[PDB]
């Protein structure tokens, strides 16, 4: 497996045309408020191809 | 997506039987220190399904 290259999976709204987002935020997919640690509905942005 | 169902994909060694690893470090996959920061060369263990 090659898992350098990721891919941002999760975000709140669709990108504008030539816009990028490097930031690196824990997403919440809940009602929780989980203070940027992975866990239940706590999903970090970037996932691996492999 | 169904993400909260996670698998333990880079360990330094396999298992023992009827052992599990909750454990949540840093696969260091290279030869720079991770430092608990993701990036090149440095995955979090556990990924999740989708």
């Given at each position: 497996?090659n898992y350098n290259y990721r ?41 691996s191809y492999?």
């Amino acid at each position: 497996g090659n898992y350098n290259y990721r891919y941002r999976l999760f975000r709140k709204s669709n990108l504008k045309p030539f816009e990028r987002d490097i930031s690196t935020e824990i997403y919440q997919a809940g009602s929780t408020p989980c203070n940027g640690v992975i866990g239940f509905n706590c999903y970090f942005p970037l996932q691996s191809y492999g």
